Amino acid sequence: SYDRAITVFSPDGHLFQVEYAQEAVKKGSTAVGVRGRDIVVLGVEKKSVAKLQDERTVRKICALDDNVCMAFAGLTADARIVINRARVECQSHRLTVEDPVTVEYITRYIASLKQRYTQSNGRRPFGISALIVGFDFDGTPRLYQTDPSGTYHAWKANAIGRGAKSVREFLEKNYTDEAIETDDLTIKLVIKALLEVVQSGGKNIELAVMRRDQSLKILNPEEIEKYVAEIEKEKEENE
Amino acid sequence: MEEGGRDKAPVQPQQSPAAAPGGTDEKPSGKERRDAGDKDKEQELSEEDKQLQDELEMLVERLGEKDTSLYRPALEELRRQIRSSTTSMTSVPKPLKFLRPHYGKLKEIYENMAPGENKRFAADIISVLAMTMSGERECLKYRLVGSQEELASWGHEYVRHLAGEVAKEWQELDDAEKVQREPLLTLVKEIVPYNMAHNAEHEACDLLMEIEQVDMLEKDIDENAYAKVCLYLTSCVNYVPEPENSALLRCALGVFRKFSRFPEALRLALMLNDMELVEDIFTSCKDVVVQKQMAFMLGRHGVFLELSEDVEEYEDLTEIMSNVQLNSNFLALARELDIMEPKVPDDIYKTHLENNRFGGSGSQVDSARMNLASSFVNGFVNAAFGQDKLLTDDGNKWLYKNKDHGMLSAAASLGMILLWDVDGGLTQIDKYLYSSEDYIKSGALLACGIVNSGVRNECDPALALLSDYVLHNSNTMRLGSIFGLGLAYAGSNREDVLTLLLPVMGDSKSSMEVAGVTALACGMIAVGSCNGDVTSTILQTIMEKSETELKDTYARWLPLGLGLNHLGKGEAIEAILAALEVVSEPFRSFANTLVDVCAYAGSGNVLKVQQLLHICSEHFDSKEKEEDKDKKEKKDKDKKEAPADMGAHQGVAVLGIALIAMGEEIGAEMALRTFGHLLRYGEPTLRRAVPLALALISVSNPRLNILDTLSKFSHDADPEVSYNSIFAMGMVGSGTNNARLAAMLRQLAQYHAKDPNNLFMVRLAQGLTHLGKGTLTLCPYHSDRQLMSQVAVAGLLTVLVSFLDVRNIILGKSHYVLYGLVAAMQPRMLVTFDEELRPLPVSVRVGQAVDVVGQAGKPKTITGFQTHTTPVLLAHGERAELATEEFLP
Amino acid sequence: KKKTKGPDAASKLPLVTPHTQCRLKLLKLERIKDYLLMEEEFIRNQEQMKPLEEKQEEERSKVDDLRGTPMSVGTLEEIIDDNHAIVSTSVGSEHYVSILSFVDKDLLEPGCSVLLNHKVHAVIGVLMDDTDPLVTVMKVEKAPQETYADIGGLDNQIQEIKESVELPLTHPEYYEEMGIKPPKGVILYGPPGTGKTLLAKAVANQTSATFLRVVGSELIQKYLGDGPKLVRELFRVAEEHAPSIVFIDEIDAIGTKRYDSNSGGEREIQRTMLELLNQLDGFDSRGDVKVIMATNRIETLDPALIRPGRIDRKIEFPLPDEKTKKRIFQIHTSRMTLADDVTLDDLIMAKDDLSGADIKAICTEAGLMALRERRMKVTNEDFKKSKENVLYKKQEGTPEGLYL
Amino acid sequence: PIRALDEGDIALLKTYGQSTYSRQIKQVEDDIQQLLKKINELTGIKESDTGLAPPALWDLAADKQTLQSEQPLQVARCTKIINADSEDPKYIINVKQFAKFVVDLSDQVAPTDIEEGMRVGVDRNKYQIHIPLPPKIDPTVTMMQVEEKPDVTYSDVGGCKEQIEKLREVVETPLLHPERFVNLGIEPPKGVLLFGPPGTGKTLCARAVANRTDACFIRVIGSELVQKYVGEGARMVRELFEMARTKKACLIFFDEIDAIGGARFDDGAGGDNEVQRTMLELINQLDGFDPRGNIKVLMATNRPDTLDPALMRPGRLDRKIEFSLPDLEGRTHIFKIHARSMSVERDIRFELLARLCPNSTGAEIRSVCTEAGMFAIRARRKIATEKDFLEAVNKVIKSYAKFSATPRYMTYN
Numbered sequence A: 001s002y003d004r005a006i007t008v009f010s011p012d013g014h015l016f017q018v019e020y021a022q023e024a025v026k027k028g029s030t031a032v033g034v035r036g037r038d039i040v041v042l043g044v045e046k047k048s049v050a051k052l053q054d055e056r057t058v059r060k061i062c063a064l065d066d067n068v069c070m071a072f073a074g075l076t077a078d079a080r081i082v083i084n085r086a087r088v089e090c091q092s093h094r095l096t097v098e099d100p101v102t103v104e105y106i107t108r109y110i111a112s113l114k115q116r117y118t119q120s121n122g123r124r125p126f127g128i129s130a131l132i133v134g135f136d137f138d139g140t141p142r143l144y145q146t147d148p149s150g151t152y153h154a155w156k157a158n159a160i161g162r163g164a165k166s167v168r169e170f171l172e173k174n175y176t177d178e179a180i181e182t183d184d185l186t187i188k189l190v191i192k193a194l195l196e197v198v199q200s201g202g203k204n205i206e207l208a209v210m211r212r213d214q215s216l217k218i219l220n221p222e223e224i225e226k227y228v229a230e231i232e233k234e235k236e237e238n239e
Numbered sequence B: 001m002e003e004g005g006r007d008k009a010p011v012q013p014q015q016s017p018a019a020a021p022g023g024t025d026e027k028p029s030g031k032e033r034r035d036a037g038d039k040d041k042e043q044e045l046s047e048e049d050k051q052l053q054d055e056l057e058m059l060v061e062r063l064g065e066k067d068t069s070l071y072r073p074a075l076e077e078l079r080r081q082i083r084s085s086t087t088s089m090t091s092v093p094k095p096l097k098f099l100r101p102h103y104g105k106l107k108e109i110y111e112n113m114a115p116g117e118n119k120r121f122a123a124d125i126i127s128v129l130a131m132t133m134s135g136e137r138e139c140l141k142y143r144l145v146g147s148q149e150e151l152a153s154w155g156h157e158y159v160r161h162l163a164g165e166v167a168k169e170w171q172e173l174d175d176a177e178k179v180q181r182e183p184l185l186t187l188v189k190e191i192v193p194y195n196m197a198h199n200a201e202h203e204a205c206d207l208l209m210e211i212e213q214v215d216m217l218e219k220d221i222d223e224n225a226y227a228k229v230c231l232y233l234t235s236c237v238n239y240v241p242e243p244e245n246s247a248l249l250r251c252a253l254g255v256f257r258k259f260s261r262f263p264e265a266l267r268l269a270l271m272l273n274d275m276e277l278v279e280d281i282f283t284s285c286k287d288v289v290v291q292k293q294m295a296f297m298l299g300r301h302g303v304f305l306e307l308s309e310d311v312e313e314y315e316d317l318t319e320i321m322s323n324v325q326l327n328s329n330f331l332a333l334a335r336e337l338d339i340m341e342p343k344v345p346d347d348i349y350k351t352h353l354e355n356n357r358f359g360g361s362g363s364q365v366d367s368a369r370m371n372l373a374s375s376f377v378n379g380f381v382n383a384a385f386g387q388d389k390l391l392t393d394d395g396n397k398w399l400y401k402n403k404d405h406g407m408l409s410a411a412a413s414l415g416m417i418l419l420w421d422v423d424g425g426l427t428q429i430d431k432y433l434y435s436s437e438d439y440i441k442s443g444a445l446l447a448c449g450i451v452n453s454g455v456r457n458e459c460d461p462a463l464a465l466l467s468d469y470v471l472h473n474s475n476t477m478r479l480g481s482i483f484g485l486g487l488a489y490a491g492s493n494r495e496d497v498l499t500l501l502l503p504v505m506g507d508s509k510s511s512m513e514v515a516g517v518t519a520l521a522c523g524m525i526a527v528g529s530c531n532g533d534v535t536s537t538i539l540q541t542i543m544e545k546s547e548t549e550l551k552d553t554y555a556r557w558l559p560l561g562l563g564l565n566h567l568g569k570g571e572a573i574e575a576i577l578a579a580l581e582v583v584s585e586p587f588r589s590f591a592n593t594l595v596d597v598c599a600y601a602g603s604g605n606v607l608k609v610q611q612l613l614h615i616c617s618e619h620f621d622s623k624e625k626e627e628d629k630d631k632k633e634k635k636d637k638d639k640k641e642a643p644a645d646m647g648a649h650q651g652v653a654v655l656g657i658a659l660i661a662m663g664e665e666i667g668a669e670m671a672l673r674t675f676g677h678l679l680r681y682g683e684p685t686l687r688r689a690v691p692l693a694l695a696l697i698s699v700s701n702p703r704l705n706i707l708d709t710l711s712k713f714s715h716d717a718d719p720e721v722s723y724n725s726i727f728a729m730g731m732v733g734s735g736t737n738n739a740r741l742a743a744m745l746r747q748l749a750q751y752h753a754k755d756p757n758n759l760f761m762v763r764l765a766q767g768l769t770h771l772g773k774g775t776l777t778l779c780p781y782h783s784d785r786q787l788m789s790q791v792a793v794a795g796l797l798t799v800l801v802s803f804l805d806v807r808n809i810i811l812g813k814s815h816y817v818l819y820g821l822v823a824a825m826q827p828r829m830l831v832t833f834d835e836e837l838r839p840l841p842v843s844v845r846v847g848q849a850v851d852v853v854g855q856a857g858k859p860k861t862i863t864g865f866q867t868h869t870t871p872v873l874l875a876h877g878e879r880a881e882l883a884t885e886e887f888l889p
Numbered sequence C: 001k002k003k004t005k006g007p008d009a010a011s012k013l014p015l016v017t018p019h020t021q022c023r024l025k026l027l028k029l030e031r032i033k034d035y036l037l038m039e040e041e042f043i044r045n046q047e048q049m050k051p052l053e054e055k056q057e058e059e060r061s062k063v064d065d066l067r068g069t070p071m072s073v074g075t076l077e078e079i080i081d082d083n084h085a086i087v088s089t090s091v092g093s094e095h096y097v098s099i100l101s102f103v104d105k106d107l108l109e110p111g112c113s114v115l116l117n118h119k120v121h122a123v124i125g126v127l128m129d130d131t132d133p134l135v136t137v138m139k140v141e142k143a144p145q146e147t148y149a150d151i152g153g154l155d156n157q158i159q160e161i162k163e164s165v166e167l168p169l170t171h172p173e174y175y176e177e178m179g180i181k182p183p184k185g186v187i188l189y190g191p192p193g194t195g196k197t198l199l200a201k202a203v204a205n206q207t208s209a210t211f212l213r214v215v216g217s218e219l220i221q222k223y224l225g226d227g228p229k230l231v232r233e234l235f236r237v238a239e240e241h242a243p244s245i246v247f248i249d250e251i252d253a254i255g256t257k258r259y260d261s262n263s264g265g266e267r268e269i270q271r272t273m274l275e276l277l278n279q280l281d282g283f284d285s286r287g288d289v290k291v292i293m294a295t296n297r298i299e300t301l302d303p304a305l306i307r308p309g310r311i312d313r314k315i316e317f318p319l320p321d322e323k324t325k326k327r328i329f330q331i332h333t334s335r336m337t338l339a340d341d342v343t344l345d346d347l348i349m350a351k352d353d354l355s356g357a358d359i360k361a362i363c364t365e366a367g368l369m370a371l372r373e374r375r376m377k378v379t380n381e382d383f384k385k386s387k388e389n390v391l392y393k394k395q396e397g398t399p400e401g402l403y404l
Numbered sequence D: 001p002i003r004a005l006d007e008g009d010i011a012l013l014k015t016y017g018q019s020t021y022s023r024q025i026k027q028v029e030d031d032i033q034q035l036l037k038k039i040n041e042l043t044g045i046k047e048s049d050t051g052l053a054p055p056a057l058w059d060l061a062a063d064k065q066t067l068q069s070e071q072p073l074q075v076a077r078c079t080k081i082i083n084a085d086s087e088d089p090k091y092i093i094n095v096k097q098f099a100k101f102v103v104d105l106s107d108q109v110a111p112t113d114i115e116e117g118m119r120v121g122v123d124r125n126k127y128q129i130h131i132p133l134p135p136k137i138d139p140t141v142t143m144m145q146v147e148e149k150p151d152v153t154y155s156d157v158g159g160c161k162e163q164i165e166k167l168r169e170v171v172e173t174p175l176l177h178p179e180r181f182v183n184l185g186i187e188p189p190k191g192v193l194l195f196g197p198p199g200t201g202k203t204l205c206a207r208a209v210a211n212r213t214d215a216c217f218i219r220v221i222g223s224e225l226v227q228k229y230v231g232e233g234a235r236m237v238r239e240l241f242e243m244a245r246t247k248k249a250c251l252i253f254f255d256e257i258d259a260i261g262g263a264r265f266d267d268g269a270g271g272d273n274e275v276q277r278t279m280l281e282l283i284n285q286l287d288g289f290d291p292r293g294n295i296k297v298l299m300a301t302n303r304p305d306t307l308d309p310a311l312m313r314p315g316r317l318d319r320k321i322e323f324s325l326p327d328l329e330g331r332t333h334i335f336k337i338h339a340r341s342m343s344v345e346r347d348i349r350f351e352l353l354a355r356l357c358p359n360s361t362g363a364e365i366r367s368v369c370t371e372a373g374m375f376a377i378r379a380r381r382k383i384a385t386e387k388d389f390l391e392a393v394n395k396v397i398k399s400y401a402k403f404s405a406t407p408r409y410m411t412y413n
């Protein structure tokens, strides 16, 4: 109505185009992530393989460096563009200053890049929301979550994608004030968080972990079902 | 046209039957192998239940009909094997072979011979293979055979054995809801000899299981709502042993057999008391069973538990008789003071306060009768020990002002002001009793008798009141002294009090009202036996009423007392006896229908109602039988108050149109009594019908009839915004609704609407389905039946105690041994389940929940939680022990 | 006293609670039948045994003959003098007629219909009521069969509408104590085939006041002056009666944005809409009348019909979620014979876009397909064929997952 | 493939599991409904609706004078006269439904008091003039006027100070203190139009002025004027104004002028053009010569842009008052008005609520108040509290037509 341009103000002061691109993220597959005392783990679902093409070129989680991880939602090509730009930026920073890249610096850089496609006309805003997970500052973990508008925040347990609200609802009650040790218990929490897959195929979950120490670790489809079995075993204790 | 590529069965199973007559002929190979090859196919196709168009029956019926007709009768060489096979393979097709006229052909094949067990291939099929047509045959052919020739051939013995095996089959095929159709056959087989069905089904359920009986019990108990009287009694008595024989619960036997005390048989109640003393061995199973035995069914049972264990095993009788009554009074005091009850409200009369500005100014009411009605309002609203100290001195000044009759009524108001009191109510009355005034003394005696009414203990049976009775020097100071006694021993049929009150009517006093009150007292003292009272009453009627032709006070006390003395019996022999006793002139024949209907308190008999409406139908009644039609309409509500609630609505439909629109005297005058007696809940249907034809008095008709409609306006207890109507009617009651003719009526109605917040309930329905007693008094109160001019004077003596069968409102109470627990439950609407396989939700609206000892309310079902196990009666009794048991780790 | 409750309900008795081939139902309907026959017999005897009759007082026939046999009906418009009023006939021809006696000269009022003679044309009576057979026909008197038991679970909406239309009647003690006026207007909006008319039926089934039902594109006549007058008479007859309720269905045929254009017929439509809009909430009073108004698309309505004060509660009916589908399936197949094999879990969970009417059609199609091969019991494959083979028209969007 | 159910299969289908009480049931319902039909037919109605009086009132007058009243009098149809020939005894008359005839007087009537232009009674046969009649007073216009006092006070309108001042200036002051205008030398206007968004608060102000008016008030139905017959709307318009002029100090109030007419277009052949005439009959009657005087007219509408510009001529409509959404003190005052008659917790502040409803009119605030009451009812409470209003606000104002509810003010912190 009063929109259709990226630099106009509605009578009550909104930027309707940014808001319109805001909802475009929720069309993607959900993904969550949490941090722990020793381990940080992020999980993705809704892979829904088409069983007739290879799956090594459909990656959704990528490492911006050797000691940081990122996940995304929304459409695809913009994600690839941002990934490439971020990798170049972090490597250049390591070149100009010998210290490694802190998890906060690269997030702020991504925020600035997404910010600078909003002021001018003739530039369509990016349509993705990112999750950054790292621990690089003296062995301490953190995660951050960004927005298509260009503002970042610090969380402890987030959820994005189609239907993140229910995952929230689950999280704010099931996440415990108990500072979570025993990393396997954190992974159990992540599995039970993704348990609300809209169809629960059992084999539509994928995890990635990072234990303050080593590079990326990827789970394989043999411990996922043992975790499922242990979840059923704990759940059968209803009486 | 679908035939071809598969119909080889219409080829080979067509040639085999075609030469089957040849098999019965010289070739025994067809007699054996072909019979086997047909029977095996038939059994296989009717065995499975997957294809409901049987592929063998439906390709044979056309030829198979004549084949079976000409095979069995034209064989003449019936060997066991060949004839058995023929009967087996010609008995099954008949359901498809013939049409509805098949009752004469259920046996044309099966009866020829019994091949083994007919249920062997008819064992696990529910209502498909054979049990449907077998059930139909046993239902109808057996009844036709046993209509008069009950003792006959196999049609009784072997039919009995077949019924037993078919009941076993109904249980063993699927054990499904078709079990509730097994009682059908039980009531269709030996219709008249139902006993030999019901006992059989009892034994069959004895080794069935101890848990699958409850559904059968409920089905029978709700099938007993209406049937033949003898069938009703048989079904009730056969239900009685069911919770004992198969199941060993035996806890509801004491509750579901009190219902068979009066209606079933006096000896039935004797055996119920016998089983209640034989049982109750567990101490819990005695204090609960005795809770309802007094305050929920009737009195006169304080001496049946006085055996040689009278320390605690037989001291419970005195507890539940009167000591439990005192404890309940103390509880109903403490709880009421805890929740909602200020000492001296007296506001509802003063509620007409926003009208002070309306209609100009006040200072209009100066009527002396007003003071009477005011006192009655202040009495009725002040029940449940709402005593007013020195606030009743207004009644003392009015007692010293005017209205000697109003003085008596005001004096008697203190009876119901301090109700159900034993400590000091008599002491409070005694101070004003010695006042040297005849009316004051009579009112004091009435109040004293009212105070201990319903307690029926041995406190002061005849100490004070009877000493004045035996000194009946004054005409007025003689009736109430005896009349209250009748109320005081209403539940007691003690012959001592009966013969002691008989001399009141035998004194030949000039006061006919005294004789009437004595008749009322003797009627309301006993409701069962003692025909000698009936003989004495009838003799007094013959010797007195013959010489007089006065007001119906004769018809208001003699025939009413006669009906009360023989109330609630469907034998009709007592009805015929009293009928042939009093054949006389029509003014006395008014009592014929009264005594006829008083013995029909409640049952399903459309014959009875049909003759009830045919009797006073139109007749044009040119001042001939107006009293007869008046009692006919006043009683049409009776006999219909337990019709399974269909009859109530249908009756309201009939009365709303028939008598209301095309009526002259029975309609325009005595048509509001039936609504005033039909229900006491308060619903928009009747509350709308009444005012529309009532607030418009229709002065053209006997405008006083509209006044009657005012009284039944207050037929609803439990105060509500109904007031808002009558309040308005009060203002139009200044000019219209004549003050000198309807002011006291409107005021007493408005006092009855919001009368006593606690103890509001008064509907003679303790338990979901019980109405044992309490209708006795309520009948006399409503027995004014017009003649409100007479009521204006009589009521000052009568209306104070006219309705004195009030039970307390509240039913929800923990009722622990020390009353420890408070409450944990969810009150809700009435039941929402009858015969559901899925979970039974009794509580339609569980949203409502309270955790106090507070009131129950009329349309409320209560369920519990927090695992208290509530092992008393699980429904509601106001005195459940509810011991805890939670063996659930 | 007004015309009073004027209740509209047949509602004899519904207790067929066995809902099977049990004896209880047979005995109960036996009781119903014999009561009805009893009442019929009573009315026959009432009408057959009337012996009294004169009913003319030697003058009633005199008055009957003094007035003409084919009396006509006219419209009084003024009364200049006693015994010389002035009336008019249909064609607008006034006549300075006289007024005779035997006509209570109390209830006559300018605008009231009167009874006139032919030959001399004087006033001889007053016609008590005049309601055309377009408004009395709108009324209902036989309640529809459904009730709350059949609704598949809409607890929020049911509680809402109950607080709207039912609760102020039965228990009107709270509202006065709090000092609030209960709401009077309700809109039911949402996608098609969800249950908007079920609540109308269910409410009409169980109530105590008068019910009036009107469908949208019926308030329209072609004579340029009948629409608004018919609306006015509708509300007049509703208010003179009991605390009635009015149900206008498929509104959007009447109200849409009130813009300015050329044709005169559309001007008439706008004129009628605007008259109703005044009638609902205009000058002084409104009365004790509730209005329910149902539509399946709401954005195209005139902003003056929807503002609060005129319509106070709006109720959206959304598509069913997976909790409700089980309830719907349990209701619509209750009276069905059915086999131990089937499990409704697969049918309810496989799909995620369907409504109540769709479920009913699936049930009937599956049952019929079972009948096709000569059976009564229903199996799982029948339900599979019913769901997939028909009952699904399609749509497309978001191609090939641009989002991942 | 598939096959068609044959007769034998149909026969067997109605055969297995029928139960022993199938038809035995249905025949019952059948005859039930049939006897229902019968019992309802046997009932019809009764009337007793002729208005006959008690017989005592009839008296014996029925024979004496009612019988002697049919034959002596005549109908005497009533018409008007347009052009009285003077000194020439021929008159001209029109029935307004018939044609025009030349007619004369009767024998007994003087030819003096027969002033031209008034209603007369006329014989059916000879069309002679017999008696005069007073000018018509229209039956619908008699109850057109309110003759009643709605109980709404100036004290009950909050947040509209200026508009109340201007309306008072137009209506009340010239009717009570008519000296300031002649003292300074100005003339009082005679027409005010009201406009604003729907719900702003117009008709309420109109009702308020009809309480302290101390003068005749006339409510006018916008949709009553149009008629099925030709030539009716204009007639009622002129009757309205003449009857208004008869008495002194009467006010006129209109609603939805856009119903009667606010545009003029060509063609519209047939039915439409009639309404055109009607509106014209108003306009030329609204002004012209002979100042109307202390007769004031009010126009109120919600759709001002569709009005005929001829209405905005100086002299017809003089002042136009705009109603606007209340800013801040309007909201606090409106809350204070509608929430002084319900039980509330005594320590609640209303300015906080005034913040959280930025663009809202009086209707929405009133609905918020009642809604908070309902949420108090749902739980068993006697006195409503803070949280009640806080929840009702989310229920009403914002909830309808929301956007980005889940994103919320993520970017606006």
Ligand SMILES: Nc1ncnc2c1ncn2[C@@H]1O[C@H](COP(=O)(O)OP(=O)(O)OP(=O)(O)O)[C@@H](O)[C@H]1O
Binding pocket: C150, C151, C152, C153, C191, C192, C193, C194, C195, C196, C197, C198, C296, C328, C355, C356, C357, C360
């Ligand atoms: N929740 C439900 N429970 C039971 N039946 C339902 C439910 N929802 C829908 N139905 C079914 O939907 C039908 C009712 O029609 P409905 O009220 O949905 O029409 P509507 O919304 O007025 O549609 P339209 O736009 O065509 O007029 C019935 O077949 C009813 O059984």
Ligand SMILES: Nc1ncnc2c1ncn2[C@@H]1O[C@H](COP(=O)(O)OP(=O)(O)OP(=O)(O)O)[C@@H](O)[C@H]1O
Binding pocket: C304, C309, D156, D157, D158, D159, D160, D197, D198, D199, D200, D201, D202, D203, D204, D205, D301, D302, D334, D337, D361, D362, D363, D366
């Ligand atoms: N300033 C205000 N003060 C008090 N109440 C107000 C105010 N503004 C609006 N209202 C409320 O608005 C409601 C109706 O207002 P009103 O009838 O005047 O609207 P309107 O603008 O004439 O509408 P429409 O043009 O649609 O007829 C009333 O309940 C009134 O209390």
Ligand SMILES: [Mg+2]
Binding pocket: C196, C197
């Ligand atoms: Mg519909």
Ligand SMILES: [Mg+2]
Binding pocket: C282, D202, D203, D204
């Ligand atoms: Mg308005």
